RNA sequence: AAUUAGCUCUUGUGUU
């Protein structure tokens, strides 16, 4: 279903799960690695 | 042998890959250091991008 | 006469003579740490 | 030296309050502001 | 580095005055009074009882720098009446208020913890 | 740097979620060194085959 | 790094709440409430446990230098 | 001169108990660092005692 | 203001009433991608807002477009500063 | 051009702190009694520190500043002792010293926390605020890690360091209803009713007296454990008076030479 | 829904990001995709059946406040503040004093700062729960008064509170790492670390080597000062004295001293030398909203005003600072940081929120039993009478920039001399 | 090359001949202090006592040179250098014998520096005549240069971390020459535009137009106690 | 009384 006006939690839990899955320094250890 | 390549650190050739806090603890190394930075002649270098 | 240093790894403090490698007894570990000053220490508690 | 001891009785600040209008000074600059809009529309309609 | 010592704020030196008098020139029956390692503490007791006095015409006090521990007090009082009799007796009346005040807030503390 | 062109050193319309558009050196190199956003990913490359 | 023995602003003893304060966390109590239970008034002493944070619990963690 | 590197303790005065270490000193006062500042202080002799 | 110590009417109509239109260049923010200033506008906007106006005072906050327009119009402040003092001090030594 | 008759009222009186009235006296000497609160009445804290084994994770400057900001249960033994500067004496005595002594080792896993109960003093009379809720804590050890010192309290007033600060908080208050204008409020309509408000719900400011003056100042002295609060509060007065009938003297030495 | 409630229990099951990727929710847009699409700033707000503006959206931005990066996603209300302001506080956030990593005491880094008692900020984005700034803080809550008191704070300057001082307030720790090794100088050179000795050195100053032990290093816990001896070290043509010394004013406590060899297996010693910092005058203190500032004076708490109860600011700063530089910001905080501190929790301070405004946090805090407006009646510190201008106050975060003034004072008269050109020496 | 060691900035002539490095200088941060006047620059303890001046030793003034040498260079109103006439300098750093801390009519003294010294004050981007002003010394506790409000805008100073430079001259003719033409108060009207360089700035111009307002009043004590303030007060008070 | 060249970062001037 929709997520009508409850929508702050939601923006910021995908946020927190983008964050927990990738770091900050993403982009040097993915090129070294490669 | 060829030579040798330095490693960035937290990288998948880096000892320190998927250690838990309490390895990183045990090992001096603080469990927030995001790494991302190499070690030359003991001094912390790293690239712009 | 003799130097008392600390490993960092095994914490056993180890007796070393001038002129001789740096290397502890056991654990085999190159890094020793110097033990504290026996002259008195005084702080203000300012 | 005078006006400065002075100051310590009068007391200068800056806060909040003094950013704050009366709530109809508002309305007028939102008026204003809605009337320019669209001003600025009729001119773009007529370029158009 | 260019720290002053904390005691500087209230201890005196070898050859210091607590206190110096020096008569102005500027108008008759006015006096400085120089004040060493005091500041306002001192200084807006002193003013405000000599103010209470009806022979005073003048009476103010001033800190000259913040990092210097020293105020000045100046007094001009009305002729047959030197400002130094002026300045003790707001001492001395300064004295009686505060002995006095102590002793009651004694009476009144008994008072309280007696219900 | 020390060069006399100034449209590089801008804050072009197109950094918009890929560079910060407030952290830069305020010395001689204002506006050519300059911070990923928070959420900005660079890709690593793939074959094209 | 460690609670502060005495509140920055007006001096008053801090040092010996901190213990409490995460009790009364741990305790289902709202932070203001746990603070207003503490006996602190001021909001001075309040942001003094309000906004603190204990390095400590993670310094120690690392092996001792010496042993 | 004996009293030059010697660990000494401020007898008297404000600065009493405070203990240091003698730099320069001469037949009639000494400079002293002191352990507890960042600073280095001139005192006389008859205020100082030598510890250790 | 009225003392002259600090300030000027103009920081109190923009503290107050309204920021005002943001400029590069000395015009109005530029077609950055193709015919729009932001992906947020459709093509070929002209309008107040989209073009770099911002109706907002910094009493009530800035929104994101108009934050970074404002961010753009702050950054040729900085730049011409940097430019300038090394083009002005060649002159004046030249005059000296 | 003689002193007034200040009349005293305590309101309220418990283990922490004094609320009081004083009616029939300057702002002035008000203010002043504030100051001497703050600043300038004689306690006891700890002043020198000799650390002999320090193996924690804080530095050893760290540990003497936590240890100098704890309060010393110090009642009577203020007036006795001598300053530290005054004491013709080699070497701290007990006349104007009070020795603490601290030794913790920690051993077991569990982490050890050092706290004011681990402080010794070889004084009775003079022991931190301890004395009958946990303690202020000072380090936390693990195992391996001592902490062997010993200190030396001397006296002392807040002018010179704030750990020699015995009051907690001053809370000095005049005129609560704004009847000599000596504050103006914008808008007077926007403004809490103060505490000792005898004002109805109404209004919000007193109307205008143009002849008056600062009376019936409001204190709430509330100490940080050293000193009992009225104790803060009839040594401050006694500080005071001291100060006075020295600068007295003073001035009779100066004119009889004059 | 469905995709929110499986990522709120994630760490639970194995739903993460990727999943949400996989299921074809988000999508990578590059720089160059971005020009052919069309974004929603907000889906509730610009998606919803109002006057047809596009109706024809294909993406919706996550956040708005995403386009910041680090620095910048510090600041408290950086959309009510000047762009040059964020800038600087950009800026100077990369020079505040704080804990720069947990396990400070094991390495020997040179030019480490430290405080004692950093702060988790009173109000916070949320962008910096991201950033760990809640694990490693960098600077102190402090009740600042925006205030004229004496004039010692006029222009970009500030009063500290002494008293607050000291009680550890900004109290800091600088430490400061010496490496030296000895070396195959030569066949006939060679260095050594070995303790001079007046019968056996020809080349020697009146530099003291007692501070320091029998194996020419100095020891732990040691007090050392300027023109001080830490490793000695002689090297032979009987001897020259090539020994380190500590750098001129500099006055610290020898910290740690550690030994090893080096990769080619010589004998090599690092030295970590701690100094205690106190918030002297002349020392740089900024907000979060480039209001940097110099310490002025200290006045003790008693010199300082307050409140009817017995709060004195820790910080006053002049109201000059504010009217030019469009720091609204600043002000919002702090209106904030008195509603954070009595309701008892950490205040949000999102960039783009609308769920926050003055008006709302200015009712909250009239719940309090304080002026909406933040102002206060203040009493003269001096006098004890009160301010007839009402002063605004309330807790804000400063951070401490690393530039001290000790670090800094420099004279000269007459010192070293260059070689080619007979001229003072630079530096 | 040889071409390469003249050519341009860093070369001899515009790097080491139109401008050098000089001695007898200090830098520091700048703090605020209104209870300076104008012409007046609070150095600290320390920089006073590095950095020396040399003083002629005469009948008038061979006492209070006896007794600065006496000093030494331990407590700071003291002295570091004292030359003979006939060009031998003697260290006062090595405690020497007592017969060398003699001295006569014809010798020189380095005292450190003292209250009432005239010194030069710069601001790097010097970039008209009054960004290097005279000043007069005066000592003060901690370690920052304090100056003046009113002189901070020909200086174009902000005390938020500016530093600045204190150069001393030391000779009597640079003295006098700085003294007559470069001080301060002689340099409040520029040629540049004909008007004060010089103003009131800050929460000074605000209190003072707050102050002279139609509606301010005020009471005997406080009048008293601004008038203590005045400099140039006659001691009389103005009838109400 | 113990050197230099290069590079990098940073501080103040970013006001109406
Ligand atoms: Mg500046
Ligand atoms: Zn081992
Ligand atoms: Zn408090
Ligand atoms: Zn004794």
């Given at each position: 279903e929709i997520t009508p006006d409850l929508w702050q939690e939601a923006c910021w839990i995908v946020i927190s799960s983008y964050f927990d899955e990738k770091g900050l320094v993403r982009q040097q250890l993915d090129s070294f690695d490669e | 042998f060829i030579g040798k390549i330095p490693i960035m650190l937290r990288s998948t050739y880096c000892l320190l890959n998927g250690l838990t806090d309490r390895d990183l603890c045990e090992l001096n190394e603080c469990p927030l250091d995001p790494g991302g930075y190499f070690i030359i002649n003991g001094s912390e270098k790293v690239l712009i991008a | 006469q003799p130097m008392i240093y600390i490993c960092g790894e095994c914490h056993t403090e180890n007796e070393i003579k001038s002129?001789?490698?740096?290397?502890?007894?056991?654990?085999?570990?190159?890094i020793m740490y110097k033990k504290r000053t026996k002259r008195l220490v005084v702080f203000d508690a300012r | 030296t005078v006006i400065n001891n002075w100051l310590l009785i009068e007391g200068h600040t800056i806060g909040i309050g003094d950013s704050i209008a009366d709530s109809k000074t508002y309305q007028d600059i939102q008026n204003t502001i809605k009337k320019a809009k669209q001003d600025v529309i009729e001119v773009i309609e007529k370029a158009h | 580095m260019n720290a002053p010592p904390a005691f500087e704020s209230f201890l005196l030196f070898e050859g210091e005055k607590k206190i110096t008098i020096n008569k102005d020139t500027k108008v008759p029956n006015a006096c400085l009074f120089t004040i060493n390692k005091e500041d306002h503490t001192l200084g807006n007791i002193i003013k405000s009882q000599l103010l209470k006095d009806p022979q005073v015409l003048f009476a103010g006090y001033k800190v000259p720098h913040p990092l210097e521990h020293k105020i000045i007090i100046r007094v001009q009082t009305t002729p047959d009446y030197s400002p130094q009799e002026a300045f003790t007796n707001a001492i001395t009346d300064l004295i009686s208020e505060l002995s006095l005040l102590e002793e009651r807030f004694r009476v009144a503390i008994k008072d309280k913890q007696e219900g | 740097r020390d060069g006399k062109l100034a449209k590089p050193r801008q804050l072009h319309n197109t950094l918009w979620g890929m560079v910060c558009p407030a952290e830069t050196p305020e010395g001689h190199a204002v506006g050519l060194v300059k911070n990923l956003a928070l959420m900005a990913y660079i890709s690593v490359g793939s074959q094209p085959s | 790094m460690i609670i502060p023995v005495r509140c920055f602003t007006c001096g008053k003893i801090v040092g010996n709440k901190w213990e409490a304060y995460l009790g009364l966390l741990q305790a289902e109590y709202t932070e203001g409430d746990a603070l207003d239970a503490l006996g602190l008034k001021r909001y001075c002493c309040r942001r003094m446990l309000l906004a603190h944070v204990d390095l400590i619990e993670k310094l120690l963690n690392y092996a001792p230098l010496e042993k | 001169n004996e009293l030059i590197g010697q660990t000494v303790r401020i007898s008297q005065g404000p600065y009493k108990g405070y203990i240091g270490v003698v730099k320069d000193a001469t037949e009639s006062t000494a400079r002293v660092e002191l352990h507890s500042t960042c600073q280095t202080i001139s005192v006389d002799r008859q205020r100082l005692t030598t510890v250790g | 203001v009225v003392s002259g110590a600090k300030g000027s009417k103009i920081n109190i109509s923009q503290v107050i009433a309204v920021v005002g239109q943001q400029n590069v260049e000395g015009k109005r923010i530029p077609f950055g991608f193709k015919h729009r200033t932001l992906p947020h506008f459709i093509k070929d906007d002209y309008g107040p807002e989209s073009r770099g106006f911002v109706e907002n005072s910094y009493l009530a906050g800035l929104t994101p477009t108009e934050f970074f327009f404002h961010a753009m119009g702050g950054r040729e402040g900085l730049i011409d500063t940097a430019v300038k003092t090394a083009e002005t001090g060649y002159i004046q030594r030249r005059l000296i | 051009p003689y002193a007034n008759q200040p009349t005293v009222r305590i309101t309220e009186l418990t283990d922490e702190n004094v609320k009081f009235i004083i009616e029939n006296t300057d702002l002035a000497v008000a203010n002043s009694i504030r100051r001497v609160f703050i600043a300038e009445v004689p306690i006891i804290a700890i002043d020198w520190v000799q650390i002999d084994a320090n193996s924690s994770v804080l530095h050893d400057e760290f540990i003497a500043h936590r240890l100098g900001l704890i309060p010393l249960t110090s009642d009577d033994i203020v007036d006795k002792l001598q300053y530290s500067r005054d004491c013709?004496?080699?070497?701290?005595?007990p006349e104007c010293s009070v020795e603490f002594t601290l030794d913790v080792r920690c051993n077991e896993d569990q982490t050890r926390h050092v706290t004011s109960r681990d402080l010794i003093s070889?004084?009775?009379?003079?022991?931190?605020?301890?004395?009958?809720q946990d303690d202020i804590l000072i380090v936390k050890l693990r195992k391996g890690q001592e902490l062997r010192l010993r200190a030396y309290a001397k006296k002392g007033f807040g002018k010179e360091h704030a750990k020699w600060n015995p009051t907690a908080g001053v809370a000095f208050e005049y005129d609560p209803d704004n009847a000599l204008r000596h504050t103006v409020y914008p808008?007077?309509?926007?403004w809490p009713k103060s505490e000792y408000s005898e004002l109805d719900e109404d209004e919000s400011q007193a109307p205008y007296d143009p002849n008056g003056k600062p009376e019936r100042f409001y204190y709430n002295v509330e100490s940080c454990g050293s000193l009992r609060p009225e104790t803060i509060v009839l040594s401050a007065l006694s500080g005071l008076k001291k100060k006075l009938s020295d600068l007295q003297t003073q001035l009779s030495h100066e004119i009889q030479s004059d | 829904k469905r995709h929110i409630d499986q990522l709120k229990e994630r760490e639970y099951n194995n739903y993460s990001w990727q999943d949400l990727v996989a299921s074809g929710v988000v999508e990578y847009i590059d720089t160059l995709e971005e020009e052919t699409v069309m974004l929603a700033m907000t889906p509730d707000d610009l998606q919803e059946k109002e006057v047809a503006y596009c109706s024809t959206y294909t993406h919706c931005e996550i956040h708005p406040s995403m386009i910041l990066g680090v620095c910048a996603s510090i600041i408290p209300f950086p959309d009510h503040n000047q762009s040059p302001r964020n800038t600087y506080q950009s800026a100077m956030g990369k020079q505040a004093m704080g804990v720069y990593i947990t396990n400070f005491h094991v390495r020997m880094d040179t030019l480490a700062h430290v405080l004692y008692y950093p702060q988790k900020p009173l109000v916070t984005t949320r962008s910096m729960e991201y950033l760990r700034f809640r694990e490693l803080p960098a600077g102190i809550n402090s009740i600042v008064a925006i205030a004229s008191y004496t004039g010692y704070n006029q222009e970009d300057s500030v009063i500290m509170n002494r008293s607050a001082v000291d009680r550890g307030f900004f109290r800091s720790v600088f430490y400061r790492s010496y490496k030296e090794q000895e070396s195959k100088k030569g066949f006939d050179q060679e260095e050594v670390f070995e303790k001079p000795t007046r019968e056996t050195c020809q080349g020697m100053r009146h530099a003291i080597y007692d501070k320091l032990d029998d194996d020419g290093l100095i020891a732990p816990g040691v007090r050392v000062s300027g023109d001080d001896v830490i490793i000695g070290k002689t090297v032979t043509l009987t001897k020259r004295d090539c020994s380190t010394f500590l750098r001129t004013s500099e006055t610290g406590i020898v910290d740690q001293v550690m030994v090893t060899l080096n990769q080619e297996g010589y004998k090599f010693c690092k030295i970590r030398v701690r100094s205690v910092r106190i918030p002297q005058i002349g020392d740089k203190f900024a907000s979060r909203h480039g209001q940097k500032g110099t310490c002025g004076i200290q006045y003790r708490q008693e010199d300082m005003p307050f409140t009817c109860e017995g709060i004195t600011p820790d910080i006053i700063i002049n109201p000059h600072a504010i009217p030019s530089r469009m720091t609204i910001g600043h002000l919002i905080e702090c209106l904030q940081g008195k509603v954070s501190a009595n309701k008892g929790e950490i205040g949000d301070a999102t960039p783009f929120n609308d769920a926050v405004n003055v008006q709302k946090i200015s009712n909250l805090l009239s719940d309090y039993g304080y002026h909406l407006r933040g102002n206060e009646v203040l009493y003269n510190g001096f006098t004890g009478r009160k301010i007839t201008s009402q002063i605004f106050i309330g807790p804000t975060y400063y951070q401490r920039l690393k530039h001290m003034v000790d670090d800094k004072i420099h004279s000269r008269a007459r010192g070293p001399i260059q070689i080619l050109n007979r001229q003072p020496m630079e530096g | 090359s040889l071409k390469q060691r003249l050519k341009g900035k860093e070369g001899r002539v515009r790097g080491n001949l139109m401008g050098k490095r000089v001695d007898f200088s200090a830098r520091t941060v700048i703090t605020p202090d209104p209870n300076l006047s104008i012409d007046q620059v609070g150095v600290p303890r320390s920089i006073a006592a590095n950095m020396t001046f040399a003083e002629i030793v005469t009948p008038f003034n061979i006492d209070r040179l006896q007794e600065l040498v006496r000093r030494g260079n331990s407590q700071y109103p003291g002295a570091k250098y004292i030359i003979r006439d006939n060009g031998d300098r003697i260290d006062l750093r090595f405690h020497p014998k007592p017969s060398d801390l003699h001295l006569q009519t014809g010798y020189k003294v380095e005292r450190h520096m003292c209250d009432g010294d005239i010194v030069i004050f710069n601001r790097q981007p010097t970039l008209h005549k009054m960004s290097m002003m005279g000043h007069r010394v005066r000592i003060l506790p901690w370690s920052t240069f304090r100056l003046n409000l009113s002189v901070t805008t020909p200086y174009n100073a902000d005390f938020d971390g500016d530093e600045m430079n204190l150069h001393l001259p030391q000779s009597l003719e640079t003295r006098a020459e700085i003294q007559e033409l470069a001080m301060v108060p002689r340099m409040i009207?520029?040629?540049?535009?004909?008007?004060?360089?010089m103003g009131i700035v800050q929460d000074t111009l605000t209190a003072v137009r707050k102050f002279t307002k139609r509606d301010v009043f005020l009471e005997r004590g406080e009048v008293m106690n601004l008038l203590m303030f005045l400099s140039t007060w006659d001691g009389k008070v103005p009838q109400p």
């Open positions: - | - | 002129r001789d490698p740096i290397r502890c007894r056991e654990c085999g570990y190159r | - | - | - | - | - | - | 013709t004496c080699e070497e701290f005595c070889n004084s009775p009379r003079v022991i931190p605020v301890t004395s009958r808008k007077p309509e926007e | - | 009207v520029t040629p540049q535009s004909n008007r004060p360089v």
